[PDB]
Structure formats: C-alpha cells, structure tokens
Amino acid sequence: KVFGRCELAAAMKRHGLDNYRGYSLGNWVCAAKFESNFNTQATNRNTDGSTDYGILQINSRWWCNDGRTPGSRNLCNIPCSALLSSDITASVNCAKKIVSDGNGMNAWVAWRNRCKGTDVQAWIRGCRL
Ligand SMILES: [Cl-]
Ligand SMILES: [Cl-]
Ligand code: NA
Ligand code: NA
C-alpha cells in the first residue's frame, strides 16, 4: 500500500506515535516519507547482507527475522515480512522498541539527514487529525 500523507499521519496518531518518547507526529511522517516514500512494500539490501523492510525500513540485522541474515537478532520477535503489510501495526510496535533503545530517532539515517532540525510540523499541515 502507498499511503497518502494525511492518511499515514492519522494512522500513526491512532497507534500512539504522536509525541512518543518526545517525538512529535511530524517527525514520524517525515521519516516514513524519506525512508520508503510511504510504501509499505519497500525493501532495500545493505552491504553487510541485512535488509531493510517496510514503511520505516526496519533492519534485519537486529529487529526482525528474514532467514538470511546470519548471526542477526530478532528483537521485535517478528518475521520481517510482517513489516510489509498494509496494516502498519507491526511496523509501529517495532519502531517503538527501536526509538526507546537509547539513540532516539537517530536510528533512522534519513531522519537524521533530512528531518532533524527542520520544520517537521509542515508534514502534518492541513491534515484533519
Ligand atoms: Cl509535528
Ligand atoms: Cl531522544
Ligand atoms: Na525526545
Ligand atoms: Na534478524
């Protein structure tokens, strides 16, 4: 599924991401835009052999099991394919564990380089929330 901007904002708000660990909703929408272009089916392979999955590009070396990242962990206790569903519940629940692990949203390289320190509230401007 390819979300619309305000559609994803409302879905994320309903799943408890607005101001989760201090990060306003605009941060999460900005991160999804540049990680996946709002596409739940996005995948990308990394040089170390791991793969990133879904709307928030969650990485298989630490967070999900895909059966082909030897020596990796599965800290969210889910198959990586669950992160590609049109239902974002699994992605959101895993993202809450990632952002709580000490490094905040710096875990998402595109957020660090393209959202951090910008006017992120612009990403939810005009949406009915
Ligand atoms: Cl915001
Ligand atoms: Cl933080
Ligand atoms: Na914070
Ligand atoms: Na893994």
Curated annotation (Swiss-Prot):
Active site positions, chain numbering: E35, D52
Documented EC number(s): 3.2.1.17
Entry keyword Hydrolase: yes
Family annotation (CDD domains): LYZ_C
PROSITE patterns registered for this protein in UniProt: GLYCOSYL_HYDROL_F22_1, GLYCOSYL_HYDROL_F22_2
Subcellular location: Secreted
Tissues with expression: In the egg white and polymorphonuclear leukocytes.
Biological-process GO terms, alphabetical: cell wall macromolecule catabolic process; defense response to bacterium; defense response to Gram-negative bacterium; defense response to Gram-positive bacterium; killing of cells of another organism
Occurrences of domain C-type lysozyme (ranges): 1-129
Keywords noted in UniProt: Allergen, Antimicrobial, Bacteriolytic enzyme, Disulfide bond, Glycosidase, Hydrolase, Secreted, Signal
Reactions it catalyzes: Hydrolysis of (1->4)-beta-linkages between N-acetylmuramic acid and N-acetyl-D-glucosamine residues in a peptidoglycan and between N-acetyl-D-glucosamine residues in chitodextrins
Quaternary structure and interacting proteins, as annotated: Monomer.
Descriptive protein name: Lysozyme C
Organism, scientific name: Gallus gallus
